[PDB]
Design a protein around this ligand. Structure first.
Ligand SMILES: COc1ccc(CCc2nc3cc(-c4c(C)noc4C)ccc3n2C[C@H](C)N2CCOCC2)cc1Cl
Length: 127
């Protein structure tokens, strides 16, 4: 099996805006996770071909990763902060669905998710 194409990251047919919350999601939330020592396997779509995981995309139908999230933020793809928060949650949940507790990748996701929740608890005020 091939990989699927990556998630869309730019769409000129969607209106665009900058907001305090979206800026914070890029500058604080995404940055903090991106620079973390456990970021690597979450920095791009799961490459099921290279990883030899023929069932990955049989199981995970809503893939998401931080590379995609970073590009979406940079390209003003999200209008509301909750759209971006949902993408992070999808990323973590996919890891937990596909893998097993105690797997090294799950321990890494759990560490990143803890930091994510910490930073989201300090979202700035809405316009
Ligand atoms: C430039 O070369 C690379 C670039 C990216 C990757 C992907 C890394 C990766 N991407 C990964 C993605 C997952 C993953 C995730 C995330 N959710 O389910 C699974 C399975 C789990 C592990 C992942 N891993 C770690 C893999 C297996 N091994 C890489 C070689 O060193 C030992 C570790 C690999 C290589 Cl060799």
């Amino acid at each position: 099996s091939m990989n699927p194409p990556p998630p869309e990251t730019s769409n000129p047919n969607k209106p665009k805006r900058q907001t305090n919350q979206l800026q914070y999601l890029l500058r604080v939330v995404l940055k903090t996770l991106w620079k973390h020592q456990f970021a690597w396997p979450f920095q791009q779509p799961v490459d099921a071909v290279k990883l030899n995981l023929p069932d990955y995309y049989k199981i995970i139908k809503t893939p998401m990763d931080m590379g995609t999230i970073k590009k979406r933020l940079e390209n003003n793809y999200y209008w509301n902060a909750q759209e971006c928060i949902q993408d992070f949650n999808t990323m973590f949940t996919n890891c937990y669905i596909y893998n097993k507790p105690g797997d090294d990748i799950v321990l890494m996701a759990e560490a990143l998710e803890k930091l994510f929740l910490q930073k989201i608890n300090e979202l700035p005020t809405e316009e």
